[PDB]
Amino acid sequence: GAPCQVVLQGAELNGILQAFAPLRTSLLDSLLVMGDRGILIHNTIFGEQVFLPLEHSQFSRYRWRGPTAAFLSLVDQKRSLLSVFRANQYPDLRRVELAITGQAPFRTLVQRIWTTTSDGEAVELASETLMKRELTSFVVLVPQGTPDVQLRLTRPQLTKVLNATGADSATPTTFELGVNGKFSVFTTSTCVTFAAREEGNAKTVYGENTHRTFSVVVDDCSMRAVLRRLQVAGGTLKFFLTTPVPSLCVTATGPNAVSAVFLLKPQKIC
């Protein structure tokens, strides 16, 4: 095998077939950051930052040796290393291997696809093998730390919450969890509330560290656009309040595991 290799056959390849399906074409043009922990798939949709982790756990064989290596997903500015996992682009596929060979700064990935031939082993699409050399300089900036509070929604709950905020600079949209645990979002026109329940009706949300109140507000409006452009089926909201620019990450719990990180206005707390 390759010095660095990542294999997926079924019962781990079907798992990624669930992960990638809704994501659609956006994240085709991405950054894959591969290391010993897995592949982090970073993109920016409408400016706002998006990451899709796919951990070493989640493959049929993960072997990483070397520094971390970042490949621009697009090969030759037309084809993607991540279109192999588009919902139905290669029907009947069976295996995908990521082979990363070469020396620490200059490695190349080669992505080999295979199909289950009708009653057969492989059709290996040498007409669809992709070969990418790595970036050799990259600085990607990644969410840090644990959240200052986080709030699990089902899908309808989150579709409501997103549908409340406004996608234009004129409205700024505010998220506030006040005392007794009634978590709310609103603007000059819309408002929505839910009741927060701990972990350790249809208008309630389960979360951790709700006792940490907050009241944050959001500008530079892309958030509904993005969490629909990603097709998020409900997910956790998680708020990082500590920062000189506090951050909101909507992490899906869904068949995907995508996450979109947004920034907010500087907020006084404590």
Binding site: R37, P67, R133, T136, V139, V140, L141, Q144
Partner: protein, 1097 residues
Amino acid sequence: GPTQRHTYYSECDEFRFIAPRVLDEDAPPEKRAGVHDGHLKRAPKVYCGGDERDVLRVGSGGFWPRRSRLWGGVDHAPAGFNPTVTVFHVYDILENVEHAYGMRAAQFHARFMDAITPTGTVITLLGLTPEGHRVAVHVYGTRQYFYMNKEEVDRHLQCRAPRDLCERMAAALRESPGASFRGISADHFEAEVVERTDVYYYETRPALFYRVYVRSGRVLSYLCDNFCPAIKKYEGGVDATTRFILDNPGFVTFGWYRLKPGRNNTLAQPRAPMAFGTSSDVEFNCTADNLAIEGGMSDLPAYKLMCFDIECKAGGEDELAFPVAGHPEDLVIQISCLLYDLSTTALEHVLLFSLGSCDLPESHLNELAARGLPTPVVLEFDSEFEMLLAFMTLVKQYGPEFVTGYNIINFDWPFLLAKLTDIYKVPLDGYGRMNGRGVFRVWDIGQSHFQKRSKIKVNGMVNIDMYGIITDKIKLSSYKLNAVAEAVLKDKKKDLSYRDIPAYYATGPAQRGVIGEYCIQDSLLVGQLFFKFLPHLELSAVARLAGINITRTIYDGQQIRVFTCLLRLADQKGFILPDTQGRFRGAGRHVGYQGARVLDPTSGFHVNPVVVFDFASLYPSIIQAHNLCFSTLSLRADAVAHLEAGKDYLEIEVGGRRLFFVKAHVRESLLSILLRDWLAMRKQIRSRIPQSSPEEAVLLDKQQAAIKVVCNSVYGFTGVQHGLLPCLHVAATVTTIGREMLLATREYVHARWAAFEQLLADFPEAADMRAPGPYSMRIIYGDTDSIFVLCRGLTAAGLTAMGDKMASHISRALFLPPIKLECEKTFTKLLLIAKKKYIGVIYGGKMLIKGVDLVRKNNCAFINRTSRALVDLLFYDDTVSGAAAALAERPAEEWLARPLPEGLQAFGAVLVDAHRRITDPERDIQDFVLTAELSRHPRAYTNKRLAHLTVYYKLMARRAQVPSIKDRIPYVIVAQTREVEETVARLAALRELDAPRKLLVSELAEDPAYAIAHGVALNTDYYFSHLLGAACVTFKALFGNNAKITESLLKRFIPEVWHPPDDVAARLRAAGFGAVGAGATAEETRRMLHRAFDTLA
């Protein structure tokens, strides 16, 4: 006084004083800017040293040399000056009209007055006796004439005698819409019935024609334009000079001559000095029977060359505006004027005309003395008129037979003549070799989509602009005199930009001396280029051969050379050439007929030997071999019915037309005789080269080269739609036979030598030549007159020799005797890129690059240098040539999916190196100067969105130096910043009212000088994308000629970077995040990465 008036200033006492106000030493700071401009009542003065003189004074003493005898009606020769003239060189021929009433007092003999009695054309042979005396011989009996079909004019005009035709033409010249020909009789023509044949269409019969014998070309031009416009006049486009040359056998327009005793003992008779028509020492009048060609002498008699160069200053508010000759305040400040001897090539005088005091630097004067050059003579003037009058007085008194300079037809002479006509109103008609009424004109291309070039015609004065010469002989992106000096002479001169000339001019005499230093250096370099290329010798060789004077050789195109030679031959044979452009005289990519066809190349990288069989002089050999001409053609099969199918005539379908050309034993082609006679003549000369002196070897090289370029244009002369004697049947036949010849050669090679046994059977030495692999001899390319034969399984070592035996075999087998296939080259490697594009390495020889934009003038030095580095890797690095050859083992699309072969690592390295040399902020901007020719007047362009037109109109908007038509306009592609975006936006707003985004490359074009003076950044995107584009254009032959695969694979070499943008980078740094790139240190980046993922988990 003189018989004919002298219209050059011999006296002046009042003139228009224009002079910069900064010159007046004592003046206050207020009265220093501007220009004194008013009329002054004194004679023009010239100051040399402490001395002073009237400009127009020809007493003894003078600040410049003189070769004149007369000066405004005073004979300034030593007493008894009466040199005997036998032999004289002739460098130019003028044709003037003289009248017997104008020359009553001139005391000519009766012969000459008879030749001019109302009127007559006098052919003035301008020359030099071997003692150096200037001389004019006036030849008197020549007449111009044309033919009309006798029956045609008889039935159209009811002409019962030749006297009736003469009367009728005289009548029609009386009754012209203007009064241009008043008092013109029927004794001004002389009709005679001759039997001649039209030159076309071999069935054509000899008919009776009137030949008319008019006395002036003005009268001829009128008659041929307006007299019986239905009737076909035959040669009324012919000069009196060409009748003088052709009607006297042996006469030349450029050569030595003799005064004979003539028939009935009539000798040439010298003019009295007052009857002189030219600024010449001695002056004869004769008839052609008094002249003999005087072979035996071949070398020039010490004509003088004047290499000159003006320097101009911009008055007005902006003196950083380029000078404009129309502005009285924008004035010529200096003129360097170098006087060489053309026989010994020795710089004799260095003159610097200066407006204001000028003290040449001592380093400059010491350099001139070190090189043995003459000491400069700085002439100082108070006003511009004094300077320009003094320069024009030099040009008249010295009277250089040749003048030269760099770009003197586009800038210098137009500026001087604009000043002398617009501003000072000096008549320039007598400032040439004639004392008056002479042409002193300059034609720019201007609005003429016909003209290829700007012309200058001074009578008796051969202007050879070295700008045109170097544009013909050397391929440069830029033809600036500094660039040309770097490229041709290896002399790195120092330039003086015009923007510096105001400041220098205002300091005082020393800095004007510095301006004079650059003006003299420019003239000295141009003299060096002139005596390197020796344009006069090859232009005179073509002039001798063509039968035209050297000025027409320089200026009036290719067509008149072939036409005159054809006219001589045709007249000898009893033909006459019809005027049909004379009727045309008031006249996406059109093509008259079908051209050559290029064989579909077997593109790719061929690392086997490739023999190149090419035809020696293909088209002219076809014209000779097949006897093509006007007079052998026959569109009708009726014409040849009395002749045999072969053995008397070829018949061929040329445009779906089924033409017939009779063979040389039925009628020998006139174009064939011209080409054959010249190719025999040239073989004679080229054989005499090796066993003659170096000095005569230089002339003979010029003479044979003249023959070469004269026998290349015969084909195209026939294919000039609306030319002087077109025949698209002959032109299309030549090309049809060429296409058939090329294909026939291919089929022969493929049928004969398909197997090695046949080759060995024809050529035994092939056995010593069999390389290891399997044999094949296949044709991978051919352009018009060559085939490339990929000889797999043979060694390149002995292959041009056997290829010569092969080519001889094919020529014997297939083609007729003047046709000659031959083998000259053998590529050991060849990259066939496209139909006219290839790079090869000749066996034991150079690298040959053909049309791949290494050899095109348009690209920048950066991209061309990188491209040649890559080409040298492909051809010379055995590693890369091995990997490039192994690249053809697979279809190209499998290299997208596979690593490239190993040896190509170096090929990538060049690219990545260029990728980092291009983003360097300290990038030499001259390496990024694209260039493009302004081929038309910019109002003649359909598509006025080119980069060089954007730069053109920017230059005009800034009052910079606007380029001339046919100049190269250099430009750079600037970086598309905020400011450039709005500049283009509001120039669009302003331009369309006169009468997020990516901007076009035409809108990012900028002038490089402007881009330097201002701190404008270059478009690294454009320049790198075009670096990769030129690489992909050339190396797509390696990847199966697929430019989309080639581009992908070439872009893969480039190291790709990804950071989030600067603004968010700063804002996250404020949010505490930090660099994990290479930018500070690798070790710190590693540590930050370790804590950044440990931070993540």
